[PDB]
């Protein structure tokens, strides 16, 4: 029974670090986003100005 | 939380009380084991050994499904580093582009 | 991994690179081309002008 709960303690473990490793991604997807929202900016703002 | 824990709760209560249960009847043999047949009585308690095994075999068979669930999770878990660093890849790709 | 990854991320910078360049020398080249049209031009248009 303890090896079951481990079974899912060591996998609750393995869950929260899958859960991390999503929300890493997720943020590392954020910051891929907000900089190609800086390039796109920069290029409407140069198109624009010229 | 809403599901998962709560059913193991109610699996972990049901076992306790199958336990409690299968105590009382194990001191139930040990009360009503005025049947002193030596023969009789080593046949049932191999086959009651054969129940105890044999209950025992379901959780076997869970905690070996649960450890290819596991062992396959972490294989689940360096699939998905391969699938997110394919997934930034793509994107940089593309954004780029 | 890291010395694939690596060499991608560089790559990407030197292709990236390479359209710029190609980008801003085909600006250049459309800029100094217009500006030729008032220099030279220039010349050939008051020779133009002379003649008329």
Known sequence: ??????LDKNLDEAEDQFQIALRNHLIHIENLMQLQEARMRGLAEEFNRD | ERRRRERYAEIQQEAIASGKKNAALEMKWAELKELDECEELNREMQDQQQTFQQIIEGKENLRKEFEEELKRKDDEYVKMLKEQSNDIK???????? | EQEKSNLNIEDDGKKAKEKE?????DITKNMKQL????????????????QQ
């Open chain 1, 1 to 6: 029974e303890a090896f079951i709960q481990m």
């Open chain 2, 90 to 97: 793509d994107m940089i790709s593309k954004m780029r582009s």
């Open chain 3, 21 to 25: 360049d190609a980008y801003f020398e």
């Open chain 3, 35 to 50: 500006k030729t049209q008032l220099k030279s031009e220039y010349l050939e248009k008051e020779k133009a002008n002379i």
